[PDB]
Structure formats: C-alpha cells, structure tokens
C-alpha cells in the first residue's frame, strides 16, 4: 500500500495473509468470508508467466495478524488448506479477467476480536455503493512504493497498511490504459485534478476493497486487489476484481462444496 497509514488493531479482522511454507514469504492478501472459506485473486495461486502454480500443500493462511513478520502467538491463527478453487474462465494470458479464487480451510476457524468475516454484496448494496466518487478501503502488507532502483530506505511495512480510495467512472478507467478492461473489473484511485496520493502495490494482491453500508452498518467486500501499472503513478488507477459480478460462481462453489 502506497501513501497509506498503519491500521488500527482489529480494524480489518477479515484480512488474511497467504504465506508460503518454503521459502518463507508473503505471497498475497486474502479475505475471510465465513468460518471455512477465504477469498483471493486467482493469480496469487496460478500465474504461468512467472512459473507460479501452487498446490494446497505449499501454502498456509494466517488470520488475525497485524505485524507483517512476527509470529503473533495467541493472537493469530494459522490454518491449512483443504482445496483451492480457481474460476474456470480466469484469463491469465491477456488481462487477468475473472481474477478470483476460493480456498477451503481444513478446519473452521474460531472468531475473535481480531478474526471476523466480511459480507459479500447483494444486488441492492452493489447498486447503492458501487458509484463513481464513493470511497472504499484497501488493506495489505505489500510494497510501500513502486519497485525502482532509485528508491532509498524501507520498502516493506512493519504492520498492516490501510488506504481509502474513490471509485472511478468506467470510461476514465478505460482511457487510462491500453490493457483491455472488462465488466469483471473496476478501478479506483484519485484523478489528476484531485492532486492526492494513494494506491495498492505489489504484494497487496488478493486483499479486499471494502465499503461500509450506511443502510445496515456492515462492511461489504466489493473488490479484490488485482492489477495495475506501476504504483501511485500520475494518471493511472488500480484495478480490482468486481466481486458482485462473479457472485453466482462464488455461491455455486460454496453451496456445492
């Protein structure tokens, strides 16, 4: 997260860390959507151009975390994965269309002050809240700046970062890039005329873009950090998987399994 701030304790209790067992490393963010299911970006698990194709046994999910690097004994919970489900129409070759995956945990996790699921949007919540100018919130432990040989100093955060960003009109998103965008994506970030900063960045993928509904006081996951070009660049916007557009698939998987 670029030009964000440290999260408060318990601020995003649905935030999950996807953690590689060997070598040890942060792979991606993810989100907790029930006691046994975690949502993430497909490309965190399968992306052939970078020789990435992980199986269930390569990964752990760490839930309830604040520090990026500490083992937060008696605060975090570490869970193993039973099965990974990638959207069958995920397009890694061209534009990361339908960049979504579900993971089923081997055992249910117990909720706590630090561990609690986010809601998925219904049609009315999506129509009410997914409008240009309205702000949502993105969280992650990804890079603090776009990777560049000229950078000086710390590139990774000590604790979970948070930034709030406005949704951008579709035509503005479309004109900002030469990558083909689809109805399964939306973009967010400040426009040049607003003169403000803030973005997701590498290492934040899979994490949630959330909005709070004033109609029922609940937080909803509207997006998944997917892709961008650089981080925090002038005239660019970050791109997010449109969770409501793909909700039928999510519901099919959860109900089936």
């Amino acid at each position: 997260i670029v030009e964000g701030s440290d999260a408060e304790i318990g601020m995003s209790p649905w935030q999950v860390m996807l953690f590689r067992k060997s070598p040890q490393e942060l792979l991606c963010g993810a989100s907790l959507i029930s006691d046994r299911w975690v949502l993430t970006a497909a490309h965190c698990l399968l992306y052939p151009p970078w020789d990435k194709n992980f199986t269930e046994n390569d990964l752990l999910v760490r839930i309830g975390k604040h520090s990026r690097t500490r083992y937060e004994r008696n605060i975090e919970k570490i869970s193993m994965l039973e099965k990974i489900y990638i959207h069958p129409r995920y397009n890694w070759r061209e534009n990361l269309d339908r960049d979504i995956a579900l993971m089923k945990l081997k055992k249910p996790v117990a909720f706590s002050d630090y561990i609690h699921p986010v809601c998925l949007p219904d049609r009315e919540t999506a129509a009410s809240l997914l409008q240009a100018g309205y702000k949502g919130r993105v969280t992650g432990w990804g890079n603090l700046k776009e990777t560049w040989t000229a950078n000086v100093g710390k590139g990774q955060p000590s604790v979970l970062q948070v930034v709030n960003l406005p949704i951008v009109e579709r035509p503005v998103c479309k004109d900002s890039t030469r990558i083909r965008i689809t109805d399964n994506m939306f973009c967010a970030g400040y426009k040049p005329d607003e003169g403000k900063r803030g973005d997701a960045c590498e290492g934040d993928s899979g994490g949630p873009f959330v909005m709070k509904s004033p109609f029922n006081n609940r937080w909803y996951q509207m997006g998944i950090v997917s892709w961008g070009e650089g981080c925090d660049r002038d005239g660019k916007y970050g791109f997010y998987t449109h969770v409501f557009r793909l909700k039928k698939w999510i519901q099919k998987v959860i109900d089936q399994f």
Binding site: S5, E8, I9, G10, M11, P13, I33, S34, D35, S112, D113, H116, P117, V118, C119, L120, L129, G133, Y134, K135, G136, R137, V162, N164, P166, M211, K212, S213, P214, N217, R218, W219, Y220
Partner: peptide, 27 residues
C-alpha cells in the same frame, strides 16, 4: 454468516476507526 461485516472492536462497541467517517462522507 449472519454476523458478517460487524467488527468486535468497532461496530459492536459503537466505536469508530480513525478514517471511517471519510468513507461515509463520500456516500
């Protein structure tokens, strides 16, 4: 679940986080 989206340390105790209102103001 039935309880989704309500945080133990915030909504459940009627407390606001530091930048929450910025979201509400935009809606």
């Amino acid at each position: 679940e039935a309880d989704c989206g309500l945080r133990p340390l915030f909504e459940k105790k009627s407390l606001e986080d530091k930048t929450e209102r910025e979201l509400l103001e935009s809606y």
